Design an enzyme around this catalytic site. Structure first.
Site, short mmCIF file in Angstrom:
data_model
loop_
_atom_site.label_atom_id
_atom_site.label_comp_id
_atom_site.label_asym_id
_atom_site.label_seq_id
_atom_site.Cartn_x
_atom_site.Cartn_y
_atom_site.Cartn_z
N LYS A 84 0.82 -1.24 0.00
CA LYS A 84 0.00 0.00 0.00
C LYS A 84 0.85 1.29 0.00
O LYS A 84 0.49 2.27 -0.60
CB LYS A 84 -0.97 0.02 1.19
CG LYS A 84 -1.96 -1.16 1.16
CD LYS A 84 -2.88 -1.06 2.39
CE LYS A 84 -3.93 -2.18 2.42
NZ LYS A 84 -4.60 -2.19 3.80
N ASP A 97 -9.37 2.39 3.20
CA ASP A 97 -9.16 1.82 4.55
C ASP A 97 -9.55 2.81 5.63
O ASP A 97 -10.04 2.41 6.69
CB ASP A 97 -7.67 1.45 4.79
CG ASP A 97 -7.25 0.17 4.06
OD1 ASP A 97 -8.10 -0.75 3.87
OD2 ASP A 97 -6.06 0.08 3.71
N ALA A 144 3.20 -0.24 11.60
CA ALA A 144 3.70 0.98 10.95
C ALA A 144 3.58 0.98 9.46
O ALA A 144 4.21 1.84 8.80
CB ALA A 144 5.17 1.23 11.34
N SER A 201 -1.67 0.02 6.38
CA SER A 201 -2.89 -0.06 7.15
C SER A 201 -2.82 0.81 8.41
O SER A 201 -3.75 1.56 8.70
CB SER A 201 -3.23 -1.51 7.49
OG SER A 201 -3.68 -2.19 6.33
N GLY A 208 -11.42 -7.98 11.33
CA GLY A 208 -11.29 -7.07 10.20
C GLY A 208 -12.41 -7.19 9.18
O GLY A 208 -12.35 -6.52 8.14
#
Ligand SMILES: O=C(O)C1=C[C@@H](O)[C@@H](O)[C@H](O)C1
Length: 263
Positions: A69, A105, A126, A129, A230
């Site tokens: 990401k 997200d 870290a 996400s 999640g």
């Protein structure tokens, strides 16, 4: 019938339930959309820079999961929406032949919360996400602490105004979030006695993993601390992404209804 191709990029990618839920939507909404999408899982090499693959596969849009990401934020042509402040992108859309990055997200996490009674949060992790969650929670006016193992990545969280730790802070947190990166979360993310301490004083244990009970969640459950996996984040973030894949023609609430049902 006009066809368009989508997928989700990750490594690993075998676990992803994005194809199930996006394909269900593309099949229902082809009526309104006037194209039929198909959405595929796409395993990338660790070293991938994504854009070459996105273009070679002739994708109209894609999602991006671990561990790509932050790289997506770097390689897209243009960043739009709250992704500008997340340092991470989980949704790519080809718009007028520019590869545009969004981050769903942040809002998908927010929407997944049942209560808004939370005043502060400790994020473990870290990566992309964690960065989106910190952005979002700071935006909502919580105090945010971030706990990781190294000084790399700290500028982003410090510029947000987060309290950054490498040793677990002796403090109570309402939300304790397992957002550890490049991990499947099969393992406790902290020393078990330290986590017990947080859970006993905390209001919700939240783990971004979905589709199994992580040991992090199982510890919260044993302690009678409310806990959340999640799933609902995945479904809200995916529904938001689907809104973008539809050129904002199908609202996320309508995608969400279909996706939750099929999940
Ligand atoms: O498991 C999945 O398919 C995903 C999980 C989240 O990282 C997302 O942000 C991503 O877009 C898709």
């Amino acid at each position: 019938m006009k066809l368009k191709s989508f997928g989700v990029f990750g490594n690993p990618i075998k676990h992803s339930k994005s194809p199930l839920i996006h394909n269900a939507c593309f099949l229902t909404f082809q009526k309104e959309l006037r194209f039929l999408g198909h959405y595929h899982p796409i395993l990338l090499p660790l070293e991938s820079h994504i854009k070459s693959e996105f273009l070679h596969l002739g994708l109209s849009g894609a999602n991006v999961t671990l561990p790509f990401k932050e790289r997506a934020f770097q390689v897209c042509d243009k960043i739009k929406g709250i992704a500008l402040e997340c340092g991470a992108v989980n949704t790519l859309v080809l718009e007028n032949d520019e590869l545009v990055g969004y981050n769903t997200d942040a809002l998908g996490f927010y929407l997944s919360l049942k209560q808004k009674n939370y005043q502060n949060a400790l994020i473990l992790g870290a990566g992309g996400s964690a960065k989106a969650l910190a952005c979002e929670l700071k935006k909502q006016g919580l105090q945010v602490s971030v706990l990781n193992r190294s000084s790399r990545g700290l500028d982003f969280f410090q510029r947000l105004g987060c309290d950054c730790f490498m040793e677990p802070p002796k403090s109570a947190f309402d939300l304790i979030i397992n957002a550890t990166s490049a991990s499947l979360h099969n393992e406790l993310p902290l020393n078990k006695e330290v986590l017990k301490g947080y859970f006993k004083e905390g209001k919700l244990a939240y783990d971004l993993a979905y589709g199994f009970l992580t040991p992090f969640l199982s510890l919260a459950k044993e302690l009678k601390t409310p806990f959340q996996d999640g799933k609902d984040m995945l479904i809200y973030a995916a529904a938001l992404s689907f809104e973008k894949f539809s050129a904002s023609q199908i609202p996320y609430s309508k995608a969400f209804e279909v996706m939750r049902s099929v999940f």
